[PDB]
Design a protein around this ligand. Structure first.
Ligand SMILES: CNC(=O)c1ccc(F)cc1[C@@H](C)Oc1nc(-c2cccnc2OC)cnc1N
Length: 295
């Protein structure tokens, strides 16, 4: 059994909270796609159940064990909680906080303002999501953990409604690096030094957060519209940056452009990002800006 170190503390599979299999009930599927299915479940405490295929390799097993260790060792309101694991029965389970709002990317697309739902979303809703994730990122930063794939698809919402809280919900990329190919790398979320020299720092996540911010204020569009991975790589390496999302307030766009500074030392840390998001939320001209209504 591999050890895991976070914040200078070491943990082992023995530290994982094993939940007796008899206490766990599956309710419905939520998704598969990526390696492993996820179900809604009960332990009555409601959970999302990530499963390990019984038909897997030794490495798949170690990967699964490692993400369990990673998530269980985090303690922050904007990172999905791990209720525990069930590793002593097959298929093996990781039990997560059930985020009823689902993933952020799908939410943004599904919840875009429409003629039928003219006020489904406001600038403040987006700013609050951005703040929430930036808070999670600041926690990772101050604990020297580099996420490596901050993107809408990896964020979850506690509920569809106005009191929703956003959290980082997937750590698969970080898990892989802790221990794939070019075409699977999240190049559209990566800074120049990352995909060139394979250098990662906390400023990597700052760049990625900029792209997430664009995803949020575009209401769930794929970054760099119409560009392939290699076109983005060449575009960004040459100094190219995304335009503002439709109707995006200037102060918000400016946060994006600061996250995308070529030199990592010129990019803000998350304390500063949160400061700037806060300032945006106070500014009437920002939050009174109407989001586009999709016909
Ligand atoms: C299919 N998506 C994932 O597996 C997925 C994608 C990104 C991510 F960060 C975490 C997950 C899975 C591991 O965890 C969760 N998914 C949902 C959930 C996700 C999608 C739709 N409805 C849901 O709950 C009602 C809710 N809570 C979770 N703890």
């Amino acid at each position: 059994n591999p050890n895991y170190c976070f914040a200078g503390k070491t943990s082992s599979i023995s530290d994982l909270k094993e939940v007796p299999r008899k206490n766990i009930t599956l309710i419905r599927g939520l998704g598969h796609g990526a390696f492993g299915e996820v179900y809604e479940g009960q332990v009555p405490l409601q959970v999302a159940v990530k499963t390990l295929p019984e038909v897997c390799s030794e490495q798949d097993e170690l990967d699964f064990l490692m993400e369990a260790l990673i998530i269980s060792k985090f303690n922050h309101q904007n990172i999905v909680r791990c209720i525990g694991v069930s590793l002593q029965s097959l298929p093996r389970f990781i039990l997560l906080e059930l985020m009823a709002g689902g993933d952020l990317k799908s939410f943004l697309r599904e919840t875009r303002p429409r003629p039928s739902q003219p006020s489904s979303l406001a600038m403040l809703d987006l700013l609050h999501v951005a703040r929430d994730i930036a808070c999670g990122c600041q926690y990772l930063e101050e604990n020297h953990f580099i996420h490596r794939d901050i993107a809408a698809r990896n964020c979850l919402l506690t509920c569809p409604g106005p009191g929703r809280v956003a959290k980082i919900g997937d750590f698969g990329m970080a898990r892989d690096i802790y221990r794939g190919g070019c075409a699977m790398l999240p190049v559209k979320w990566m800074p120049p030094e990352a995909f060139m020299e394979g250098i990662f720092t906390s400023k990597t996540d700052t760049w990625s957060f900029g792209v997430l911010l664009w995803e949020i204020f575009s209401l769930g569009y794929m970054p760099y519209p119409s560009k392939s991975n290699q076109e983005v790589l060449e575009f960004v390496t040459s100094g190219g940056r995304m335009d503002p999302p439709k109707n995006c307030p200037g102060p918000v766009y400016r946060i994006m452009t600061q996250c995308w500074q070529h030199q990592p030392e010129d990019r803000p840390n998350f304390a500063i990002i949160l400061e700037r998001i806060e300032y945006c939320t106070q500014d009437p001209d920002v939050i009174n800006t109407a989001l586009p209504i999709e016909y």
